[PDB]
PDB file of C-alpha atoms and ligand atoms in Angstrom:
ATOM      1  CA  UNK A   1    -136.285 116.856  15.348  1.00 16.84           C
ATOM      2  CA  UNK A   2    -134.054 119.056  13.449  1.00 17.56           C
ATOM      3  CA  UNK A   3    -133.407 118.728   9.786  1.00 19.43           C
ATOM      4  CA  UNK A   4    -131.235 120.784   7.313  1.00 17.47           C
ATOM      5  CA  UNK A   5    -131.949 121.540   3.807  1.00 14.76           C
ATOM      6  CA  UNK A   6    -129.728 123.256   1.102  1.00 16.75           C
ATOM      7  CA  UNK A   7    -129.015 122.700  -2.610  1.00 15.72           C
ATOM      8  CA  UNK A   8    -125.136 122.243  -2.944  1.00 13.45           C
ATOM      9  CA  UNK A   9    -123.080 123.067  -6.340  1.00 12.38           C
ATOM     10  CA  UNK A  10    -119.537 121.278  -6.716  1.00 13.38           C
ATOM     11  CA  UNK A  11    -117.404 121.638  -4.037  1.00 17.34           C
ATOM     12  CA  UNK A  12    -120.265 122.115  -1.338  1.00 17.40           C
ATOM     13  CA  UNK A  13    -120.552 125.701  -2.480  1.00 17.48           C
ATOM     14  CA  UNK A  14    -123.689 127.096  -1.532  1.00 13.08           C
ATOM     15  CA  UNK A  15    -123.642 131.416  -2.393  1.00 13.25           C
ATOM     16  CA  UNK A  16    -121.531 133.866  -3.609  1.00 14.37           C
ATOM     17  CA  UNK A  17    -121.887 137.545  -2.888  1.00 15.75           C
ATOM     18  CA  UNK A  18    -124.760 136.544  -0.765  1.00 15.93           C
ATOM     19  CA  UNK A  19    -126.656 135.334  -3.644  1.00 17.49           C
ATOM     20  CA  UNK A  20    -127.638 131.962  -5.260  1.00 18.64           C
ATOM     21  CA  UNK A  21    -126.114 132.416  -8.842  1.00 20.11           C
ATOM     22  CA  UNK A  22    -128.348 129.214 -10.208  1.00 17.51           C
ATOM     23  CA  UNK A  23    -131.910 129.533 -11.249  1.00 17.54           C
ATOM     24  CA  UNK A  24    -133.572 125.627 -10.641  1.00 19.48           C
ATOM     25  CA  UNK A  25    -137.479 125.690 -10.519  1.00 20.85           C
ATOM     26  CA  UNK A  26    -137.202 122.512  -9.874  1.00 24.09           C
ATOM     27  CA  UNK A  27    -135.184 122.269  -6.205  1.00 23.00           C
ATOM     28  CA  UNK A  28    -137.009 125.669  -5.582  1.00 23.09           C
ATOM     29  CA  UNK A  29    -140.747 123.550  -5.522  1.00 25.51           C
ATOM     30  CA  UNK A  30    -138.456 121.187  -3.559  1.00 22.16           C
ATOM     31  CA  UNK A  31    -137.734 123.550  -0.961  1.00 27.93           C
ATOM     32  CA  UNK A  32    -141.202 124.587  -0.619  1.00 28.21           C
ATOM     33  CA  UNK A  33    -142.852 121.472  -0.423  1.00 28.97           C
ATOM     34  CA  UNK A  34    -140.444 120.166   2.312  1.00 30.47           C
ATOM     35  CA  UNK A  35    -140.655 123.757   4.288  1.00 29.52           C
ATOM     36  CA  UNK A  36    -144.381 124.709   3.812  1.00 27.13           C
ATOM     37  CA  UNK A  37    -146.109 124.810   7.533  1.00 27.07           C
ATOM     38  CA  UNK A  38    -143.016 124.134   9.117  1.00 26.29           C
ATOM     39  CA  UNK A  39    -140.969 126.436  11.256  1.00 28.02           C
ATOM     40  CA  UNK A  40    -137.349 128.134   9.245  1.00 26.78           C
ATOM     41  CA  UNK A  41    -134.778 128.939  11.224  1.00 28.52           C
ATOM     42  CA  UNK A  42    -132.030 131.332   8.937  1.00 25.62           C
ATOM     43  CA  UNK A  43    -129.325 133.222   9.961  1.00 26.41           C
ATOM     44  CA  UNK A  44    -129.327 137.589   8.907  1.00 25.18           C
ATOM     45  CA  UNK A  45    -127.212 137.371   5.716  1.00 25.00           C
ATOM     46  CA  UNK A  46    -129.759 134.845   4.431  1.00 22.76           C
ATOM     47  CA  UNK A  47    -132.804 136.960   5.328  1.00 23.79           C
ATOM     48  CA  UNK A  48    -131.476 139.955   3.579  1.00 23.90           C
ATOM     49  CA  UNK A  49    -130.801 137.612   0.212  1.00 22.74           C
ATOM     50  CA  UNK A  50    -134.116 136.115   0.726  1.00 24.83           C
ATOM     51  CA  UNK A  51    -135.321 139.984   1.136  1.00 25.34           C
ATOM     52  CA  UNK A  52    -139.065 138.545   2.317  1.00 25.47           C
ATOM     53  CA  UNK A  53    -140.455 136.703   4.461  1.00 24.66           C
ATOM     54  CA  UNK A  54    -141.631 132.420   3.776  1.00 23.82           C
ATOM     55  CA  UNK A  55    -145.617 132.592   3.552  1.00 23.44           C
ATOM     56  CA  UNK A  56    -146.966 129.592   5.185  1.00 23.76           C
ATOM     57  CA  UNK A  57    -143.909 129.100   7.261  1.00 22.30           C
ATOM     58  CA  UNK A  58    -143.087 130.902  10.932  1.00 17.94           C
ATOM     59  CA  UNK A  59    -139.774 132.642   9.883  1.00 15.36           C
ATOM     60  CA  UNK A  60    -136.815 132.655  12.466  1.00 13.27           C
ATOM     61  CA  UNK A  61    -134.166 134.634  12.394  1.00  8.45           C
ATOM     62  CA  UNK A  62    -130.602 134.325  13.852  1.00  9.35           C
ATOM     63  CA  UNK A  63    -129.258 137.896  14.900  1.00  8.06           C
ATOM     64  CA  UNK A  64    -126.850 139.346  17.295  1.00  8.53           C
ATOM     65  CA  UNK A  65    -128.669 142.510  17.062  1.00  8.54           C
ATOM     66  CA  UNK A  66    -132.102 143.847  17.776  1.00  9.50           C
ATOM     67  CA  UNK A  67    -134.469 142.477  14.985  1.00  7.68           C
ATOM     68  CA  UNK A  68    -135.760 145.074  12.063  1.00  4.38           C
ATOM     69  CA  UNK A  69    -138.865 143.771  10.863  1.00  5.95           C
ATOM     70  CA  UNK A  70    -142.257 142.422  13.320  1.00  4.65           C
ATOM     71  CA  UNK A  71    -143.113 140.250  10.038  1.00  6.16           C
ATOM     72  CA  UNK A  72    -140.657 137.563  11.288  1.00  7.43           C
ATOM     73  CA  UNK A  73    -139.347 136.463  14.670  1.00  7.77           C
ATOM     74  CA  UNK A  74    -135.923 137.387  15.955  1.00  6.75           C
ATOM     75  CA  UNK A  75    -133.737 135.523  17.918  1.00  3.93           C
ATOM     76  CA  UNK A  76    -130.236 135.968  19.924  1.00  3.24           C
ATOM     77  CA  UNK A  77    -129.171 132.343  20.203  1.00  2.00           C
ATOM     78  CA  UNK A  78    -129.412 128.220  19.103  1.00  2.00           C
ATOM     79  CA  UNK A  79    -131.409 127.873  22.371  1.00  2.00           C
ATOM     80  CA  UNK A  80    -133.895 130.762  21.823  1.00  2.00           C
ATOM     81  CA  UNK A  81    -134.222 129.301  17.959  1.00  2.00           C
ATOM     82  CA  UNK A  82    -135.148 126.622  18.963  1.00  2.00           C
ATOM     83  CA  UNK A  83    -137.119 127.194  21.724  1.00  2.00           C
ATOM     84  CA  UNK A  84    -139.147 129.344  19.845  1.00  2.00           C
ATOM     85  CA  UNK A  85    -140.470 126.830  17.003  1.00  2.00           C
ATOM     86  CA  UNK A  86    -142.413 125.177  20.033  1.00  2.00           C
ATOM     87  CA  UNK A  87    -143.054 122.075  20.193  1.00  2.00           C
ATOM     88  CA  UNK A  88    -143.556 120.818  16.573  1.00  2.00           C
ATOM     89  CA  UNK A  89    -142.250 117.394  15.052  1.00  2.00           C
ATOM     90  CA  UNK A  90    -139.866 118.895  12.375  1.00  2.00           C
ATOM     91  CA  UNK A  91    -138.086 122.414  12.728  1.00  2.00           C
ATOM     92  CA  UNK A  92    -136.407 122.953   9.117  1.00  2.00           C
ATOM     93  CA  UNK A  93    -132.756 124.769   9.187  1.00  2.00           C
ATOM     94  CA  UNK A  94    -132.408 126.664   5.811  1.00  2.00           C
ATOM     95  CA  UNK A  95    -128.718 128.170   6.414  1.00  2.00           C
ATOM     96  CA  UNK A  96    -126.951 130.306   5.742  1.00  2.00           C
ATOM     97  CA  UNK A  97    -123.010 128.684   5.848  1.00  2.76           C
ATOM     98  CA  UNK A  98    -122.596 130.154   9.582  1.00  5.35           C
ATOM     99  CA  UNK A  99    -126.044 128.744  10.708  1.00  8.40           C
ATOM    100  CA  UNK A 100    -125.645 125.394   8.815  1.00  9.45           C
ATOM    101  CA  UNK A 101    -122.290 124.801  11.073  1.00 10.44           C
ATOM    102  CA  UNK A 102    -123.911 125.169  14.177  1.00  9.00           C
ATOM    103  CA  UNK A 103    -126.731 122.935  13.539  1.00  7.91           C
ATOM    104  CA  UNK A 104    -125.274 119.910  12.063  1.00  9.21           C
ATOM    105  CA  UNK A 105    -124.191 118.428  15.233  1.00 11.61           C
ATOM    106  CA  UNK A 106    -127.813 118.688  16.691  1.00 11.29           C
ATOM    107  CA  UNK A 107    -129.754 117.810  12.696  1.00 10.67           C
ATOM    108  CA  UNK A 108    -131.148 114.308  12.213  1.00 13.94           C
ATOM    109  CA  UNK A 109    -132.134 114.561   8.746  1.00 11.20           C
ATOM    110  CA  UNK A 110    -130.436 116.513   5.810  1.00 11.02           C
ATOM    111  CA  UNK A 111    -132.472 117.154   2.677  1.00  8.19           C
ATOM    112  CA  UNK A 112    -129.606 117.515   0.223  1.00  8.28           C
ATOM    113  CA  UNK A 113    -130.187 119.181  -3.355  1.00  7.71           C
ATOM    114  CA  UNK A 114    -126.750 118.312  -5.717  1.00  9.04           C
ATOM    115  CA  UNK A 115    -126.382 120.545  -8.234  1.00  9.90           C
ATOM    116  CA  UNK A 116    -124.399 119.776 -11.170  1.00  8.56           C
ATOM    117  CA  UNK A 117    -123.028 123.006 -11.449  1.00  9.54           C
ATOM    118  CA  UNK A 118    -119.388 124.521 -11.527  1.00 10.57           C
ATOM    119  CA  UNK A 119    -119.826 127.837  -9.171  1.00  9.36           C
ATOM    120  CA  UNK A 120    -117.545 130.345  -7.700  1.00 12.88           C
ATOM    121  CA  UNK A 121    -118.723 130.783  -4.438  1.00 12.27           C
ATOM    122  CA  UNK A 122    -117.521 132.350  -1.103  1.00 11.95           C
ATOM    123  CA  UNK A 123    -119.861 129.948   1.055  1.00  9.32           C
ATOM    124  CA  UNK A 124    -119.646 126.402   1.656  1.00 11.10           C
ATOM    125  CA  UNK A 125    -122.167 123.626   3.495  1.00 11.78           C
ATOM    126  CA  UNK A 126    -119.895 122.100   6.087  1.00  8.68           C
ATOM    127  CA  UNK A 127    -117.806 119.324   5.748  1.00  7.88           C
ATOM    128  CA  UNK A 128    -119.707 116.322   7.188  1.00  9.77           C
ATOM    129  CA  UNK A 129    -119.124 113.080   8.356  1.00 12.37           C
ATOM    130  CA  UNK A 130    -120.068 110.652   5.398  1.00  9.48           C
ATOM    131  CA  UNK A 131    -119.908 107.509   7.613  1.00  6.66           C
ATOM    132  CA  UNK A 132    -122.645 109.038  10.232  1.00  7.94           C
ATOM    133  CA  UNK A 133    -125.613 109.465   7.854  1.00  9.75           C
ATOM    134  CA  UNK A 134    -127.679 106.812   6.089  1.00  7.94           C
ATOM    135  CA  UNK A 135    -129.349 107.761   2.495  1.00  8.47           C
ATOM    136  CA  UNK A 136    -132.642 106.933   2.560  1.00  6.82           C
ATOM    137  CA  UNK A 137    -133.542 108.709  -0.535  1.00  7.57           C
ATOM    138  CA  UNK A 138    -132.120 109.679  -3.917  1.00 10.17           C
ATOM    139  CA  UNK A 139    -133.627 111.209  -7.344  1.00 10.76           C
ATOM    140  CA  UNK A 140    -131.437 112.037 -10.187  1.00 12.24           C
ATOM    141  CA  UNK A 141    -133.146 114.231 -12.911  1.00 12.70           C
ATOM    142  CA  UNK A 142    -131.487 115.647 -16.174  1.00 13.53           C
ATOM    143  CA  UNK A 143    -131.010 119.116 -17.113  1.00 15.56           C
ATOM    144  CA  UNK A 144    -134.354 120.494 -19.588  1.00 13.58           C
ATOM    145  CA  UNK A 145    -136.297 123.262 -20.560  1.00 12.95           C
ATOM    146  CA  UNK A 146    -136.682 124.598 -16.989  1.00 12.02           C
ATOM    147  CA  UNK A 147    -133.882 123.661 -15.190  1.00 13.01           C
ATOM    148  CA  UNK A 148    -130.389 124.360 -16.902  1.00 15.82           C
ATOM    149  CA  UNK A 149    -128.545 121.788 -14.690  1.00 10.82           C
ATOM    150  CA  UNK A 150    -128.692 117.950 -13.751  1.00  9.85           C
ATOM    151  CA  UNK A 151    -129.563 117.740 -10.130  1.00 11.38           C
ATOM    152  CA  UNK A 152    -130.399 115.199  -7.289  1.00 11.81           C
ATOM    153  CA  UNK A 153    -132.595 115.484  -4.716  1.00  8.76           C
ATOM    154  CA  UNK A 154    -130.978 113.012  -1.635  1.00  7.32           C
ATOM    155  CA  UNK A 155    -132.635 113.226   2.183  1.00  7.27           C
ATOM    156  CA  UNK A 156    -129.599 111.179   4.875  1.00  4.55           C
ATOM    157  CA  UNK A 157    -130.732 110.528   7.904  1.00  4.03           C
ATOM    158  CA  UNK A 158    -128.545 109.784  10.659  1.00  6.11           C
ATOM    159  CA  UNK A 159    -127.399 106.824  11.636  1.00  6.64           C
TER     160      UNK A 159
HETATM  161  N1  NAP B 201    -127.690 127.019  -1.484  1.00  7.33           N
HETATM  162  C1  NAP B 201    -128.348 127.042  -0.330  1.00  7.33           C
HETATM  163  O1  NAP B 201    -128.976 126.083   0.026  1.00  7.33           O
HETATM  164  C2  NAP B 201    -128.273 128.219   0.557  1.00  7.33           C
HETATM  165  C3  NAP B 201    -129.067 128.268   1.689  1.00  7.33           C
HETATM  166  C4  NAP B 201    -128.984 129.360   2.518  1.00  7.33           C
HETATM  167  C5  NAP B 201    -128.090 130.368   2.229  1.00  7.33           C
HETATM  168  N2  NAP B 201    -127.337 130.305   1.138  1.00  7.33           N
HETATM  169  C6  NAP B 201    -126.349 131.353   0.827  1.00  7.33           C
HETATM  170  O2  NAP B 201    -125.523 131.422   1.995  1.00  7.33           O
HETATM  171  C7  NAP B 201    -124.944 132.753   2.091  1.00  7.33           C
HETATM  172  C8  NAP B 201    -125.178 133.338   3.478  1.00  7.33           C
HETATM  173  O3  NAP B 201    -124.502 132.482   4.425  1.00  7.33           O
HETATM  174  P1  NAP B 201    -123.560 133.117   5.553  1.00  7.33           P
HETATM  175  O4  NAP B 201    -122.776 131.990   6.169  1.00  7.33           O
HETATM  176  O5  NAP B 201    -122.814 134.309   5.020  1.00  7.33           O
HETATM  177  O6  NAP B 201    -124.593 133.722   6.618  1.00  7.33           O
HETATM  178  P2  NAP B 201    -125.815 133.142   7.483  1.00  7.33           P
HETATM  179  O7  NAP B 201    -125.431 131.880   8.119  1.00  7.33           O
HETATM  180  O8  NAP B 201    -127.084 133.264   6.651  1.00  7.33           O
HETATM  181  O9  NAP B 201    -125.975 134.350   8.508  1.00  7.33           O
HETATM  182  C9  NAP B 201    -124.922 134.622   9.466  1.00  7.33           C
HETATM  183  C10 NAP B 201    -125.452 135.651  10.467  1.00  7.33           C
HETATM  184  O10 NAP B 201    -126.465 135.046  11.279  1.00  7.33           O
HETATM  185  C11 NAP B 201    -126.349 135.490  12.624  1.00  7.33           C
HETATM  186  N3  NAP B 201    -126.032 134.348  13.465  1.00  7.33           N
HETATM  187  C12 NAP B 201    -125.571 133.126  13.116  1.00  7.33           C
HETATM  188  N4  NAP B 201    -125.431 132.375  14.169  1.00  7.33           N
HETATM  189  C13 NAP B 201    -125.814 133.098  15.267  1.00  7.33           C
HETATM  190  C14 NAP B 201    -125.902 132.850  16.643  1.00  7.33           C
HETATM  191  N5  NAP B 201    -125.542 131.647  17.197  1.00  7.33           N
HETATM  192  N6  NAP B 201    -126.349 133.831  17.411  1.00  7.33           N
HETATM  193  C15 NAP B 201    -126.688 134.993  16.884  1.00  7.33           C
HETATM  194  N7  NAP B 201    -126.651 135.317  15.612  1.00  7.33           N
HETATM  195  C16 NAP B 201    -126.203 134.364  14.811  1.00  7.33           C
HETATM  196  C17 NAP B 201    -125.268 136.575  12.630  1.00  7.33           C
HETATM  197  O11 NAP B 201    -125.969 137.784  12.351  1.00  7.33           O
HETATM  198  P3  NAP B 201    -125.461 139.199  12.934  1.00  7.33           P
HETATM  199  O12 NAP B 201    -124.162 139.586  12.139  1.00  7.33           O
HETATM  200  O13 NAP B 201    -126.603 140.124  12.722  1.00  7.33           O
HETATM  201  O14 NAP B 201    -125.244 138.905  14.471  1.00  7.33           O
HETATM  202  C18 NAP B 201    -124.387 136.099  11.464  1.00  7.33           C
HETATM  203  O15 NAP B 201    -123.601 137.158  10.929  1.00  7.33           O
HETATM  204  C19 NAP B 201    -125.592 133.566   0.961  1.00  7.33           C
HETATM  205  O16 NAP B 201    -124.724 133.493  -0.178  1.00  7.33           O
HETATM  206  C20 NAP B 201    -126.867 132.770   0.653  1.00  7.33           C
HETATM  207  O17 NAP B 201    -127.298 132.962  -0.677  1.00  7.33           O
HETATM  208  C21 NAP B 201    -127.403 129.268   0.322  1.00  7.33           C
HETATM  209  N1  FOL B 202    -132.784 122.852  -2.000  1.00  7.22           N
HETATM  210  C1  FOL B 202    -132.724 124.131  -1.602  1.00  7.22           C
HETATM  211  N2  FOL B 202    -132.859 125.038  -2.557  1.00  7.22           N
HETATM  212  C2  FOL B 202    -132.823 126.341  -2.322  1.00  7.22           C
HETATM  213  O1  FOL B 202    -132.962 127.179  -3.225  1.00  7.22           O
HETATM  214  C3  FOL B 202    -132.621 126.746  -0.938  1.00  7.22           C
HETATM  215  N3  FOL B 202    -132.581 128.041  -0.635  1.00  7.22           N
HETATM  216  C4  FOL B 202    -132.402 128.365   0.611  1.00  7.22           C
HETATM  217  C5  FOL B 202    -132.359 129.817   1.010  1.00  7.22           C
HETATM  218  N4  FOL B 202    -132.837 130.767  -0.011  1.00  7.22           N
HETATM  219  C6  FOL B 202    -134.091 130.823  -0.603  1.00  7.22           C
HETATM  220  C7  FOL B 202    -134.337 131.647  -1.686  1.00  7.22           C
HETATM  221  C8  FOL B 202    -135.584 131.687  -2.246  1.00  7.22           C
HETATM  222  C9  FOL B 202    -136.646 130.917  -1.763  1.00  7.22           C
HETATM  223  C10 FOL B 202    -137.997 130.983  -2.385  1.00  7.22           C
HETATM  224  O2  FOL B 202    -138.310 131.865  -3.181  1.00  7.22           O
HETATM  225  N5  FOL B 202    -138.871 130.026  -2.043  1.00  7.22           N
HETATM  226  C11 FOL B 202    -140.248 129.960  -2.538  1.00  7.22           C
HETATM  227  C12 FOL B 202    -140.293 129.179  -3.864  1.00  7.22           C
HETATM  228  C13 FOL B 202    -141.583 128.443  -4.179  1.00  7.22           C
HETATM  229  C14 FOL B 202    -141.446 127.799  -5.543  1.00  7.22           C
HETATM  230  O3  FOL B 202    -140.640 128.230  -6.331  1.00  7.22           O
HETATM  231  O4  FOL B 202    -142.217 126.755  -5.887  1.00  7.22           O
HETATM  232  C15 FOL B 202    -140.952 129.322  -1.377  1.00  7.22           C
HETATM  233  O5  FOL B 202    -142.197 129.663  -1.113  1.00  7.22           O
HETATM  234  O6  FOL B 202    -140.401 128.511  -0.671  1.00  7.22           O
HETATM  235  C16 FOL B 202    -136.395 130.097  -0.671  1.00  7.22           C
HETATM  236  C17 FOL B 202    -135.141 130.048  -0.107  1.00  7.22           C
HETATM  237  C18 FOL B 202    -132.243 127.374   1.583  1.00  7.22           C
HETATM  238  N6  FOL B 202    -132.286 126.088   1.295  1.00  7.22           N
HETATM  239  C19 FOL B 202    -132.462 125.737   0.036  1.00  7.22           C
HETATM  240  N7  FOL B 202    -132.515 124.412  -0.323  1.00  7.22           N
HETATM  241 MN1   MN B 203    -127.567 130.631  26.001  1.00  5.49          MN
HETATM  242 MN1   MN B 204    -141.166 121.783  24.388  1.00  2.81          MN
HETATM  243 MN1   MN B 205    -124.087 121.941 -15.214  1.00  2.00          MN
END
């Protein structure tokens, strides 16, 4: 199975200047506890803004080009990706925009973080289907202390 997870601001905008503007501690512990011993699967512009690799997690990364870096595995392809998480029950897709287009079609599960958040970006989740995915969960919380923005965590599955 192949899920997709990304935190959204308004407008689907996910990065600008290959950076996440947005600081949530919240959706960040969200990330981790839905990635931790799980394959990743990222394309190269999101490696380099990450700028390390996942602990816990076998890293994956998209590339035309020979990889730079034996800490993580490198891959040519969608096949080879996936091919090389093995045969686990969840391989987690963690973008970037690129990467996030080419797996939708083949994702059963998208763990969707929407941020209430006005952002210039120059990256965008795709435009899906609303009609073809089910929400199974939802959890609105409020802006505090921590976390400067309202947010809600959704997972769709689809239908
Ligand atoms: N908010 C979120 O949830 C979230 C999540 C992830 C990323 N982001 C943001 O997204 C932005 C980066 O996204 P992006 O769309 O620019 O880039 P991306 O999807 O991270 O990376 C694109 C690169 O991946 C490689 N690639 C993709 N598909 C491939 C394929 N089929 N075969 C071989 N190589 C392939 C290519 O690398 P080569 O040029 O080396 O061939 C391509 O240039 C940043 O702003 C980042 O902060 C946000
Ligand atoms: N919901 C969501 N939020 C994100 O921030 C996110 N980020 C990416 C890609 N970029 C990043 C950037 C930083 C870290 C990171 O530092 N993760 C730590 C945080 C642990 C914590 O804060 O509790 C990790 O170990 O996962 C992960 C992904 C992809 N999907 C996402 N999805
Ligand atoms: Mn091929
Ligand atoms: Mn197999
Ligand atoms: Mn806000």
């Amino acid at each position: 199975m192949i899920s997709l997870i990304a935190a959204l601001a308004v407008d689907r905008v996910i990065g600008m200047e290959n950076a996440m503007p947005w600081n949530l501690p919240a959706d960040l512990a969200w990330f981790k506890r839905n990635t931790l011993n799980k394959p990743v699967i990222m394309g190269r512009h999101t490696w380099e803004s990450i700028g390390r690799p996942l602990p816990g997690r076998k890293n994956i990364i998209l590339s035309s080009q020979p990889g730079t870096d034996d800490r993580v595995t490198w891959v040519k392809s969608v096949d080879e990706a996936i091919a090389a998480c093995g045969d686990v029950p969840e391989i987690m897709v963690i973008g970037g925009g690129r990467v996030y287009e080419q797996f939708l079609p083949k994702a059963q599960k998208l763990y969707l973080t929407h941020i209430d958040a006005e952002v210039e970006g120059d990256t965008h989740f795709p435009d899906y289907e609303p009609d073809d995915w089910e929400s199974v969960f939802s959890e609105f919380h409020d802006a505090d202390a921590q976390n400067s923005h309202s947010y809600c965590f959704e997972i769709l599955e689809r239908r």
